[PDB]
Design a protein around this ligand. Structure first.
Ligand SMILES: *[C@](O)(C(=O)NC1CC1)[C@H](CCC)NC(=O)[C@@H]1[C@H]2CCC[C@H]2CN1C(=O)[C@@H](NC(=O)[C@@H](NC(=O)c1cnccn1)C1CCCCC1)C(C)(C)C
Ligand SMILES: *[C@](O)(C(=O)NC1CC1)[C@H](CCC)NC(=O)[C@@H]1[C@H]2CCC[C@H]2CN1C(=O)[C@@H](NC(=O)[C@@H](NC(=O)c1cnccn1)C1CCCCC1)C(C)(C)C
Lengths: 306, 306
């Protein structure tokens, strides 16, 4: 028993991190097969950042403007192309440590592990959620660009995030691995607002089920509610509205605990309107929204990976 | 910027996990050089657990009673000895993936990463603290015994914890890698109480410094206090007393922020006596005590590892 913010084991990813330098800018790249992926603003000087023309800037670069290092091994760049906001550097050595991988674009509310890196070396791993406004509340310093987020399905690594920038609010934005930003952001140094952030309701419910599985049950009540009536109270408190798809995805946790999804919603309704009144749930005095239903199943049933 | 519960990258440890079976009991082992380490109660049947005589039980076991698997490779046990509460199985193949490692015994309040495993395969990684009463608030299911906790210093892995058991309160107990339990516990199925748990004061202060570094500063005040006066208020709230050694260890964070340790104590004093009053610190409505001063420096300065 117990419940922790658990990351995926990071071994398969650690062997793919490289250091990429262009000019005076050093950041991290992702090295899979004979391609190194990295944020395209590696080619920019500080003065280009206000209004970059990346096509023109890339045309002025030659293959030997890029230094790519895998620890001690110096990779040689054979080609370079741009896909949306990511740069693809073709290299002369394929990565022997290339895992079975795919590139996926996640949806708001889903979670992933971040391997934070500096100079191509790993600093740490942590779990986060893609917020509804397409930012992430990460932990990143100067030099972390090109660090990646990922999930693991048995022996497959799904890459879903590459880090590009920090907003003045302290939150973080980046792209998928085809180079498309999550959210409305562009890689220029201009003021760009993120939407209103909302609380991920299906995840709060998942975490309440985790609490029941762990014996923390004081908040359960006799009442019941309809999906529409719940959503009316939720939207007042800046919670995402719950859909029938969400109810279905919570099915497995409902089955294991014997508590109907709409009964759990009736408990959440009371928590929102009355507060927690000095009690805690799973050691927290706030409602937690960064575990998916699948996270809870995985951690409460001990799924493993190759 | 940002602040997360960050674990160490787990790659170097993943390649050391094996599956150990004896009788109908399968759990995890740690495979370093030609030795596999595992909890000695692998040799017990359910009926032995009430009052085991481990010396006599081990004498009745032969080398071929132990099945050790590294994925597909079947290791052959050449010898077996007991060191306190850990079993050492000598094997015929040395581990090529053996990192540079040492065995250390940590002190209460220090933190480490846990690689939770089932059947020799990794499930997840998370950060925790050794509590003052020598338990840990982990996340472990049946089958997790033999999972290990560790820190990383550049290229060295320091192993500090092997998981053995769960207490009825939902918290966890285990040994160092020389087989000695943390805390007063013995590996028998009898009622055994853990001491009173207290809050790790030096870690709360470290986390308040992390909050200042991240711009969360509302709780700072003009007041000041002496170490003795602080400790009088702390002990009333079940906080560990703060020592001069703790003040020294906070030195680096004091230097970087320009806030004297005793001034931060004066802020903590007010938080304890007046509460937080609906505000949060680093997104928490509780005072967090599972980051050491070194954790904060590492995460706020981006230390990396080989
Ligand atoms: C990353 O490339 C890295 O690790 N580089 C290694 C050190 C050399 C680096 C991470 C720094 C924390 N990322 C960046 O440098 C990005 C690139 C991509 C987009 C433009 C530049 C700058 N940058 C940032 O992350 C900056 N953030 C901003 O500039 C915000 N700007 C404003 O909020 C703003 C801008 N102008 C006027 C008023 N306000 C972002 C920019 C993009 C849209 C959201 C807001 C810094 C300041 C470096 C964090
Ligand atoms: C671990 O060996 C494993 O993963 N084995 C693979 C599945 C086959 C296993 C982890 C189970 C969650 N650990 C144990 O089985 C240990 C061993 C070591 C000590 C004795 C047995 C049982 N055990 C436990 O973790 C149990 N916990 C207890 O028995 C507590 N007992 C009581 O609180 C108690 C006992 N008698 C009367 C009244 N109360 C512990 C025992 C040790 C001291 C602290 C309290 C279970 C029930 C399996 C969690």
């Amino acid at each position: 028993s117990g419940f922790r913010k658990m990351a995926f084991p990071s071994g398969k990813v650690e062997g793919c991190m490289v250091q990429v330098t262009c000019g005076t800018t050093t950041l991290n790249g992702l090295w899979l097969d004979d391609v190194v992926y990295c944020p395209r603003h590696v080619i920019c000087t500080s003065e280009d950042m206000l209004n970059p023309n990346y096509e023109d800037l890339l045309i002025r670069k030659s293959n030997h403007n890029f230094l790519v290092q895998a620890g001690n091994v110096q990779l040689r760049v054979i080609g370079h192309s741009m896909q949306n906001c990511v740069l693809k550097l073709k290299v002369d050595t394929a990565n022997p440590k290339t895992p079975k991988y795919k590139f996926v674009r996640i949806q708001p509310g889903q979670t992933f592990s971040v391997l934070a890196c500096y100079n191509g070396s790993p600093s740490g791993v942590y779990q986060c959620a893609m917020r509804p406004n397409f930012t992430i509340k990460g932990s990143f310093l100067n030099g972390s660009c090109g660090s990646v987020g990922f999930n693991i399905d048995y022996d497959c690594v799904s890459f879903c995030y590459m880090h590009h920038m920090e907003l003045p609010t302290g939150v973080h934005a980046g792209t998928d691995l085809e180079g498309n930003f999550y959210g409305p952001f562009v890689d220029r140094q201009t003021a760009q607002a993120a939407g209103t952030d909302t609380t991920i309701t299906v995840n709060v419910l998942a975490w309440l089920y985790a609490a029941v599985i762990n014996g923390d049950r004081w908040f359960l009540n006799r009442f019941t509610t309809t999906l529409n009536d719940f959503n009316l109270v939720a939207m007042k408190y800046n919670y995402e509205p719950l859909t029938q798809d969400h109810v279905d995805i919570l099915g497995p946790l409902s089955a294991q605990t014997g508590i109907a999804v709409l009964d759990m919603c009736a408990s959440l309704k009371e928590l929102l309107q009355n507060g927690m009144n000095g009690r805690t749930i799973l050691g927290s005095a706030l409602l937690e929204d960064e575990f998916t239903p699948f996270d809870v199943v995985r951690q409460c049933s001990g799924v493993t990976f190759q």
